[PDB]
Design a protein around this ligand. Structure first.
Ligand SMILES: *[C@@H]1O[C@H](CO)[C@@H](O[C@@H]2O[C@H](CO)[C@@H](O[C@@H]3O[C@H](CO[C@H]4O[C@H](CO)[C@@H](O)[C@H](O)[C@@H]4O)[C@@H](O)[C@H](O[C@H]4O[C@H](CO)[C@@H](O)[C@H](O)[C@@H]4O)[C@@H]3O)[C@H](O)[C@H]2NC(C)=O)[C@H](O)[C@H]1NC(C)=O
Ligand SMILES: *[C@@H]1O[C@H](CO[C@@H]2O[C@@H](C)[C@@H](O)[C@@H](O)[C@@H]2O)[C@@H](O[C@@H]2O[C@H](CO)[C@@H](O[C@@H]3O[C@H](CO)[C@@H](O)[C@H](O)[C@@H]3O)[C@H](O)[C@H]2NC(C)=O)[C@H](O)[C@H]1NC(C)=O
Ligand SMILES: *[C@@H]1O[C@H](CO[C@@H]2O[C@@H](C)[C@@H](O)[C@@H](O)[C@@H]2O)[C@@H](O[C@@H]2O[C@H](CO)[C@@H](O[C@@H]3O[C@H](CO)[C@@H](O)[C@H](O)[C@@H]3O)[C@H](O)[C@H]2NC(C)=O)[C@H](O)[C@H]1NC(C)=O
Ligand SMILES: *[C@@H]1O[C@H](CO)[C@@H](O[C@@H]2O[C@H](CO)[C@@H](O[C@@H]3O[C@H](CO)[C@@H](O)[C@H](O)[C@@H]3O)[C@H](O)[C@H]2NC(C)=O)[C@H](O)[C@H]1NC(C)=O
Ligand SMILES: *[C@@H]1O[C@H](CO)[C@@H](O[C@@H]2O[C@H](CO)[C@@H](O[C@@H]3O[C@H](CO)[C@@H](O)[C@H](O)[C@@H]3O)[C@H](O)[C@H]2NC(C)=O)[C@H](O)[C@H]1NC(C)=O
Ligand SMILES: *[C@@H]1O[C@H](CO)[C@@H](O[C@@H]2O[C@H](CO)[C@@H](O[C@@H]3O[C@H](CO)[C@@H](O)[C@H](O)[C@@H]3O)[C@H](O)[C@H]2NC(C)=O)[C@H](O)[C@H]1NC(C)=O
Ligand SMILES: *[C@@H]1O[C@H](CO)[C@@H](O[C@@H]2O[C@H](CO)[C@@H](O[C@@H]3O[C@H](CO)[C@@H](O)[C@H](O)[C@@H]3O)[C@H](O)[C@H]2NC(C)=O)[C@H](O)[C@H]1NC(C)=O
Ligand SMILES: *[C@@H]1O[C@H](CO)[C@@H](O[C@@H]2O[C@H](CO)[C@@H](O)[C@H](O)[C@H]2NC(C)=O)[C@H](O)[C@H]1NC(C)=O
Ligand SMILES: *[C@@H]1O[C@H](CO)[C@@H](O[C@@H]2O[C@H](CO)[C@@H](O)[C@H](O)[C@H]2NC(C)=O)[C@H](O)[C@H]1NC(C)=O
Ligand SMILES: *[C@@H]1O[C@H](CO[C@@H]2O[C@@H](C)[C@@H](O)[C@@H](O)[C@@H]2O)[C@@H](O)[C@H](O)[C@H]1NC(C)=O
Ligand SMILES: *[C@@H]1O[C@H](CO[C@@H]2O[C@@H](C)[C@@H](O)[C@@H](O)[C@@H]2O)[C@@H](O)[C@H](O)[C@H]1NC(C)=O
Ligand SMILES: *[C@@H]1O[C@H](CO)[C@@H](O)[C@H](O)[C@H]1NC(C)=O
Ligand SMILES: *[C@@H]1O[C@H](CO)[C@@H](O)[C@H](O)[C@H]1NC(C)=O
Ligand SMILES: *[C@@H]1O[C@H](CO)[C@@H](O)[C@H](O)[C@H]1NC(C)=O
Ligand SMILES: *[C@@H]1O[C@H](CO)[C@@H](O)[C@H](O)[C@H]1NC(C)=O
Ligand SMILES: *[C@@H]1O[C@H](CO)[C@@H](O)[C@H](O)[C@H]1NC(C)=O
Ligand SMILES: *[C@@H]1O[C@H](CO)[C@@H](O)[C@H](O)[C@H]1NC(C)=O
Ligand SMILES: *[C@@H]1O[C@H](CO)[C@@H](O)[C@H](O)[C@H]1NC(C)=O
Length: 1224
């Protein structure tokens, strides 16, 4: 049955969980089984658990558990009930130094007397249902009993041996357990019903949400919940954001432990921890092991956590509901998580036993992490610090037995690692380790996903620095002198707060001047306190400290005087006795000038007449003629005769001369900047000045080297930059010069070509219309609401006023421009829906938007088009425009503020966009319906084919309008619309974006993405400036005004006011640039819609590239319009012989009136019958000539066709001969 047994694990009804431990192992499934169910009385060894599965009315039952060594000193368990009284059948149990009953019997053959020493020899009730299961499990000196509840007892034992007496019950009555098993409870209802257990295999462990399988490299597998893995923090916890921090998240081993079992284990920071790691174990000694639990009752037991320091000191962890270990008793009379618990560490050594206070235990402890270097965290807060730990012991107490096996409580052997952390709601949700060079680049910025582009990357340096030290100065006769400066004082007096004497001498004198080239300071303290020790501190008001002068500092002169000296910087020495007199010693005055005459040394340098020493062609830390730096020194062929050390015009050291031999050595940095080509979420290529790197292929561009994994040429550049383009596979190649559409220049005669077989193509263009109006409160942003700071701010006059003035002026101008810009006609809107609009052959389904009666307050809603859905949802980070937060609830203050309120509390308020996406979509639909609105009323809803025909006739008169003539154009338009939709649907899939560049969908969507990102990026960059401390005491103005007196505080706060105001001014400057840029785009859109959408354009190439523009339609876009310019492109050209004009009988010249009209001979009758046709020069539309198309000219030319009055009517059928007709 087993329903009741798993029902004893109190679990919520609709939850599915994973079981573990020494559970009953299934009647038949697996090897398992082997229920005895008969009085055979078997014997086994190494058993870790036994069970009884069926109570057939209360049959007899006997248990004998002992040690395999058969020791007499150990405790033996023997449970005996040879009774069938059910309720009265109270089972006899004797946990004693007890008869190790070998086979069977109340006493039987054994050793040890019955009652030599007993811990429990009472009677226990043993009545339960037939399907009830009772069992006992022992492991790690912990014993668990399943008698109607999951009991738990700590008991030092070794119970690998068991002997039983059995009575038959249903064929499966009692059993042993040797190894842990698992189960899957698909619970659906409370009680014994709706449980639906099933057997298991090693795959169930990963199914638990709070445990994971460690990757072989030690990283957390993706998708982990991080339910309780709080990020560690010494001072404060971030509530929402992204942080790159050094945290112990690189786990070596994860020990999933069932909640019903406690853990007693020795953990050392010097050895790989034991236990069965769920994932791929790493044989590395932990430095930070993280414990995950469910309830505080596990830890509250005294001595649960014992920390052993490297010195051997032990810290016993004690929790109690009192406060004074020294003056109160900590024997706990309370439990069940009642009242706050005050937890301490009891220092245990036979010198002095003191208690160190951790913190008030929170009402719910979920993760405690203990690391070496002496640091312990509770719920992600570093309450207490210690010295270097080396070992930790854990003595836990199972769980609360009221909700168990809801997975496992786990402990993780982790190592510190710098990882990018995404946290929202003060809880982790995803992580990214900063080890992979791609991951290193990602952690260089703060982002998990990076758009395609070139990102700066630093050349990898030597991981082991081991840098030799270089030091070069002028040659001179070597000479070293020690300057010691001995200070003599006697402090303390009475009670340690008095003084007696104080004096100092410099080499036995009150003043000294260094004459030898080398010198080394060595301060000595001849100070004695009558009360104890003297604490010494050193001041500094010089470019150097006493410890720093020995670091190869160079001077022309260096004189030290204990008294005031002219032009001498001051350094003071402070002496602190045990009780803190706080007085200072004599001030040290250092008069010095820059030069190479003398140099401080840490030790008298070797060498004769020259002390310089340096290492060639190795990344080294150098001090060259006072120029401290790190770089590579290489001998070069330069022969600069003058000078000693050479520097660029910017003051950077370039090369220095050996002077002794005349050789010069160039100084270059150890590492050089590199550009990493990051496309398709991977590093595919690196632009570097180095000749080689960790890539199998390397191509040398004229200006730089390029390393990648693909040496082939790149012909389809996914990403372009400067003169080069990079493919998605890492290939590099020059961008080919795309050949544009050919345009035929008009001419009066000779061979010409008339384009034909026109097919239309849609070219997409996006133009931004407006920006989100941002109004920042300058006063509250700068002063942070501090009244006393506003008085100082007022001294800056209009610097604060002009910011908001310009911001509001720009916002109002943009608002009024776009408001007067958007004109909407309701009649056009009527014809803009699928039911009304009728595109015969033209598929406008992807372009039009449906309209339904909205139940929301009745007002009808017109859903935006499918293309608009694709453009908005897939790009907008918030999904919808209504997500823009409102400030009505922002001042409530009853909930923790989010990012919007965080920036609003600093005076930054974001006004809603001037026009909603709904209004923009209705405007686009209005334009689409108006391009087919043939009359002032709705009764003139022309079919789109008629509008297309009219627009075709506008640019070239159609002489043969057949059905297929429009059908081919309609088919081409439908195909191009399908291509556009496929391109919008997804990137580089279902629509090959190999055709990429300007006037394409990819460029438009990249522009939309950058537009929607820049507005947030600027605001975040503004808000982060508040964190900066502009060389003041602190970033908090009230903190400054509290630490300092009013005079100095005003000076200090003025530093940040200038810093914040300059940062605020920088934001305005970039927004005005954005406003200026968007104004030009908006002005073009007004020109674009009038000259392309509301009417076809005679301007060549204005509406979406070259070709004959037939029409264009507009779709709503984020903060702008997406123009879809439909343009005709020819597929073939007809070659005909143009005619300049006609001259009949050499007496009347006759030429074409229309400049954009040609006359030619075509087809079979071009030369066999000499037939003449006229047509537009834009499209091939042959038409017989008419007298209205011809004009008379006073004179002829040679190029004109030579005809006679009889032949002319053949050329011009409409011509009539007045003389011939009248004379008949
Ligand atoms: C809360 O505040 C506590 C301080 O009370 C911080 O504790 C520090 O934790 C860091 C680790 O995050 C400790 O840094 C480690 O120091 C070890 C020993 O330091 C000696 O050796 C280094 C290197 O030679 C010397 O520079 C140093 O002066 C000491 O002489 C190092 O061995 C560790 O090396 C690890 O990092 C390096 C990279 O730097 C890796 O290459 C190594 O492989 C290794 O992984 C490490 O540098 C620091 O000592 C702790 N300080 C104290 C006083 O204990 C907590 O980190 C802080 N917590 C938070 C969340 O802020
Ligand atoms: C865990 O339990 C859930 C809940 O279902 C309940 O518990 C099961 C153990 C059974 O005893 C169910 O009778 C009981 O309602 C299981 O979800 C259930 O899965 C089954 C398929 O295995 C669903 O049956 C099908 O459902 C589809 C869609 O409704 C129908 O078209 C089919 O004709 C067929 O009926 C069943 O609907 C579904 N329960 C509910 C409430 O939707 C679940 O499979 C089980 N195991 C795991 C691993 O979760
Ligand atoms: C038709 O088109 C023009 C029109 O000329 C007219 O028709 C001719 C048949 C003659 O009867 C012309 O007298 C008449 O105006 C013809 O173009 C003509 O081409 C000839 C040469 O092929 C030109 O003569 C030249 O004149 C220059 C001096 O200007 C001399 O130096 C040359 O040696 C040569 O003789 C003549 O000027 C020119 N006419 C005009 C008006 O430019 C054309 O040849 C004729 N036939 C065809 C097939 O087009
Ligand atoms: C690990 O933790 C367990 C759980 O607290 C510790 O067991 C506890 O040890 C104390 C000290 O002996 C026991 O107190 C004594 O109990 C006996 C009855 O057994 C009583 O007669 C004494 O007067 C005294 O109160 C306590 O009962 C016992 N808890 C349990 C559940 O058995 C254990 O000592 C810890 N071990 C280490 C190494 O830290
Ligand atoms: C220990 O883990 C369990 C789950 O893994 C959690 O404790 C349990 O929390 C649930 C609700 O979160 C409690 O459910 C309640 O049960 C009562 C009894 O029927 C019911 O009337 C309520 O409506 C509610 O459903 C459940 O009792 C509780 N189990 C306990 C406390 O044993 C929690 O994550 C951890 N417990 C603690 C105290 O932190
Ligand atoms: C700058 O150029 C000078 C001159 O070329 C370099 O001086 C050279 O230094 C080396 C090492 O000190 C001298 O080697 C000699 O070796 C003998 C035998 O072991 C030893 O007895 C000498 O005391 C000396 O060490 C070398 O003669 C000397 N060159 C001279 C004097 O012309 C110098 O190393 C170069 N670099 C710097 C940073 O000064
Ligand atoms: C004009 O464009 C519309 C765009 O909606 C075309 O209508 C849709 O055409 C597809 C052809 O693949 C139909 O097939 C499939 O339908 C399933 C279920 O609706 C859908 O999940 C697929 O993604 C795919 O769309 C689709 O049923 C049909 N109707 C829709 C999407 O509502 C139409 O065929 C084009 N040509 C005309 C109207 O002549
Ligand atoms: C701190 O605790 C450790 C162990 O908890 C003590 O080390 C034990 O010392 C006894 C000495 O009689 C040995 O028999 C044990 O084997 C040691 N245990 C371990 C794990 O090594 C240590 O003495 C304690 N130190 C103080 C100052 O209390
Ligand atoms: C270009 O114009 C010439 C005359 O202006 C056309 O005449 C061709 O002239 C060549 C030269 O001998 C002959 O071989 C061809 O047979 C002529 N073609 C015709 C149709 O008369 C020529 O056809 C025009 N087109 C091209 C491509 O040259
Ligand atoms: C402590 O560890 C020293 C280093 O050896 C290794 O240490 C860690 C990194 C693990 O890899 C461990 O398995 C190795 O032993 C030892 O030299 C030293 O003896 C160790 N000390 C003690 C007391 O075990
Ligand atoms: C800690 O909590 C105790 C509550 O326990 C109750 O009182 C004791 C005396 C026993 O009778 C026990 O059975 C009860 O449940 C308080 O009595 C005690 O004062 C608290 N500690 C402090 C310092 O206030
Ligand atoms: C237990 O013993 C009492 C006393 O004789 C009796 O009345 C009762 O029925 C017994 N119960 C069972 C379950 O045997
Ligand atoms: C410290 O100065 C006192 C003052 O004369 C002197 O007697 C004593 O010897 C000095 N001690 C040292 C270590 O210099
Ligand atoms: C300075 O102290 C050093 C030892 O630190 C000693 O060798 C040297 O002789 C002392 N010089 C003087 C002038 O006291
Ligand atoms: C210096 O001259 C040598 C010999 O002519 C030559 O091998 C070397 O490449 C030259 N180096 C530079 C930097 O000019
Ligand atoms: C790749 O480009 C280079 C530079 O133009 C050219 O020499 C080479 O032939 C190209 N590769 C192939 C396979 O044509
Ligand atoms: C291209 O135009 C020529 C001449 O007008 C015509 O014969 C041919 O069929 C056209 N091509 C197609 C694919 O219709
Ligand atoms: C994409 O374009 C090709 C050629 O222009 C066309 O055959 C295909 O039908 C288009 N795809 C869609 C979905 O219209």
């Amino acid at each position: 049955n087993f329903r009741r047994f798993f029902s004893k694990f109190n679990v919520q009804a609709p939850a599915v969980v994973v079981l573990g431990g020494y559970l009953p192992i299934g009647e038949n499934q697996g090897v398992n089984s082997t229920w005895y169910c008969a009085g055979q009385h078997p014997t086994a060894s190494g058993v870790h658990g036994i069970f009884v599965s069926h109570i057939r009315g209360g049959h007899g039952f006997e248990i004998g558990i002992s040690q395999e060594p058969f020791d007499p000193s150990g405790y033996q368990l023997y449970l005996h009930k040879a009774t069938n009284g059910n309720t009265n059948a109270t089972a006899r149990l004797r946990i004693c130094q007890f008869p190790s009953i070998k086979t069977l019997g109340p006493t039987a053959n054994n050793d040890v007397t019955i009652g030599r020493n007993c811990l429990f020899n009472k009677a226990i009730p043993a009545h339960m249902s037939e399907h009830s299961v009772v069992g006992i499990t022992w492991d790690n000196d912990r014993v668990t009993v399943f008698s109607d509840k999951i009991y738990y007892f700590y008991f030092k034992n070794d119970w690998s041996r068991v002997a039983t007496k059995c009575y038959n019950s249903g064929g499966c009555a009692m059993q042993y357990v040797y190894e842990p098993t698992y189960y899957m409870l698909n619970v659906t209802s409370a009680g014994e019903d709706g449980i639906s257990y099933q057997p298991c295999t090693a795959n169930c462990i990963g199914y638990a949400a709070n445990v994971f399988a460690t990757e072989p490299n030690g990283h957390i597998p993706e998708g982990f919940s991080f339910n309780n893995w709080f990020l560690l923090s010494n001072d404060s916890t971030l509530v929402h954001g992204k942080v790159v921090s050094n945290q112990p998240l690189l786990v070596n081993c994860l020990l999933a432990i069932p909640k019903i079992y406690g853990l007693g284990q020795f953990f050392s920071f010097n050895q790989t921890i034991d236990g069965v790691c769920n994932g791929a174990a790493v044989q590395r000694a932990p430095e930070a092991l993280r414990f995950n639990i469910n309830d505080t009752s596990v830890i509250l037991a005294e001595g649960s956590i014992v920390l052993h320091t490297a010195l051997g000191t032990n810290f016993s962890f004690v929790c109690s509901n009192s406060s004074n270990p020294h003056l109160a008793t900590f024997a706990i009379p309370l439990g069940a998580t009642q009242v706050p618990y005050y937890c301490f560490f009891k220092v245990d050594t036979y010198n002095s036993t003191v208690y160190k206070f951790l913190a008030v235990l929170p009402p719910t402890v979920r993760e405690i992490v203990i690391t070496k270097y002496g640091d312990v965290y509770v719920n992600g807060f570093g309450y207490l610090h210690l010295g270097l730990l080396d070992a930790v012991t854990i003595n836990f107490t199972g769980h609360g037995t009221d909700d168990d096996v809801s997975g496992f409580w786990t402990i993780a052997s982790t190592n510190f690692v710098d990882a990018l952390i995404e946290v929202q709601g003060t809880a982790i949700q995803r992580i990214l380790y900063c080890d992979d060079p791609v991951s290193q680049l990602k952690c260089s910025q703060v982002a998990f996903d990076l758009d395609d582009g070139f990102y700066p990357f630093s050349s990898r340096n030597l991981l082991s620095h081991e840098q030799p030290i270089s030091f070069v100065t002028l040659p001179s006769f070597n000479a070293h002198s020690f300057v010691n400066i001995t200070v003599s004082a006697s402090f303390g007096g009475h009670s340690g707060a008095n003084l007696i004497a104080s004096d100092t001498t410099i080499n036995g004198f009150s003043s000294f001047c260094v004459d030898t080239r080398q010198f080394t300071i060595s301060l000595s303290y001849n100070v004695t306190n009558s009360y104890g020790y003297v604490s010494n501190s050193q001041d500094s008001n010089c470019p150097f400290t006493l410890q720093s002068v020995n670091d190869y500092l160079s001077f022309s002169k260096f004189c030290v005087s204990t008294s005031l000296l002219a032009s001498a910087c001051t350094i003071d020495l402070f002496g602190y006795p045990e009780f803190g007199s706080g007085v200072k010693f004599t001030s040290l005055y250092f008069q010095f000038t820059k030069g190479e005459l003398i140099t401080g040394t840490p030790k008298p340098l070797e060498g004769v007449t020259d002390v310089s020493f340096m290492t060639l062609d190795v990344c080294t830390k150098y001090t060259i003629y006072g120029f401290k730096g790190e770089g590579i020194i290489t001998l070069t062929n330069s022969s600069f005769l003058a000078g000693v050390y050479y520097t660029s015009d910017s003051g950077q050291l370039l090369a220095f001369k050996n002077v002794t031999s005349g050789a010069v050595y160039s100084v270059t940095p150890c590492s050089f900047s590199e550009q990493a080509a990051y496309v398709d979420d991977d590093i595919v290529g690196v632009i570097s000045s180095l000749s080689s790197s960790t890539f199998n292929s390397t191509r040398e561009l004229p200006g730089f080297f390029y390393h990648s994994n693909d040496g082939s040429n790149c012909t389809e550049p996914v990403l372009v930059y400067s003169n080069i383009g990079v493919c998605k596979s890492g290939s590099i190649g020059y961008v080919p010069s795309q050949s544009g559409q050919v345009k035929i220049a008009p001419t009066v005669t000779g061979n010409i070509s008339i384009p034909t077989n026109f097919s239309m193509s849609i070219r997409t263009e996006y133009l931004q219309l407006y920006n989100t109006p941002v109004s920042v409160d300058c006063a509250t942003y700068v002063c942070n609401g501090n009244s006393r700071c506003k008085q100082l701010l007022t001294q800056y006059t209009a610097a604060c006023k002009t910011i908001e003035s310009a911001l509001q002026l720009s916002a109002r101008l943009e608002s009024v421009e776009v408001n007067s810009m958007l004109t909407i006609s309701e009649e056009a809107l009527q014809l803009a829906t699928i039911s009304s609009f009728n595109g015969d052959g033209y598929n406008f389904t992807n372009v039009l938007g449906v309209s339904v009666y909205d139940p929301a307050r009745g007002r009808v809603v017109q859903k935006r088009s499918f293309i608009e859905d694709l453009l908005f949802n897939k790009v907008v980070t918030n999904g919808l425009g209504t997500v823009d937060e409102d400030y009505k609830r922002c001042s409530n203050g009853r909930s923790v503020a989010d990012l919007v309120c965080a920036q609003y509390y600093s005076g930054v308020m974001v006004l809603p966009g001037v026009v909603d996406a709904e209004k923009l979509h209705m405007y686009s639909a209005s334009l689409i319906g108006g391009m087919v609105l043939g009359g002032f009323t709705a009764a003139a809803a022309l079919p789109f084919s008629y509008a297309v025909q009219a627009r075709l006739n506008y640019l070239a008169l159609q002489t043969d309008v057949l059905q297929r003539n429009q059908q081919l154009l309609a088919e081409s338009f439908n195909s191009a619309i399908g291509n556009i939709t496929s391109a919008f649907e997804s990137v580089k899939e279902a629509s090959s974006q190999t055709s990429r560049g300007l006037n394409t969908v990819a460029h438009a969507l990249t522009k939309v993405q950058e537009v929607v990102n820049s507005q947030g990026a600027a605001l975040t960059q503004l808000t982060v400036q508040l964190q900066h401390n502009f060389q003041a005491i602190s970033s908090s103005i009230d903190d400054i005004y509290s630490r300092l007196d009013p005079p100095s505080a005003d000076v200090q706060v003025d530093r940040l006011i200038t810093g914040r105001l300059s940062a605020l001014n920088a934001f305005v400057a970039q927004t005005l640039t954005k406003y200026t840029e968007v104004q030009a785009s908006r002005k073009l859109a007004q020109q674009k819609v009038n000259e392309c959408v509301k009417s076809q354009s005679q301007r060549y190439g204005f509406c979406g590239g070259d070709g004959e523009h037939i029409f264009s339609l507009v779709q709503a876009a984020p903060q702008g319009l997406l123009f879809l310019h439909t343009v005709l492109v020819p597929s073939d050209f007809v070659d005909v012989i143009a005619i300049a004009g006609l001259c009949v009988n050499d007496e009347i010249a006759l030429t074409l009136r229309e400049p954009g009209l040609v006359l030619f001979t075509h087809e079979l009758q071009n030369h066999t019958a000499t037939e003449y046709f006229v047509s537009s020069r834009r499209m091939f539309e042959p038409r017989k000539p008419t007298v209205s198309d011809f004009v008379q000219i006073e004179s002829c030319v040679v190029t004109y066709v030579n005809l006679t009055r009889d032949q002319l009517p053949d050329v011009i059928p409409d011509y009539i001969d007045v003389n011939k007709t009248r004379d008949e």
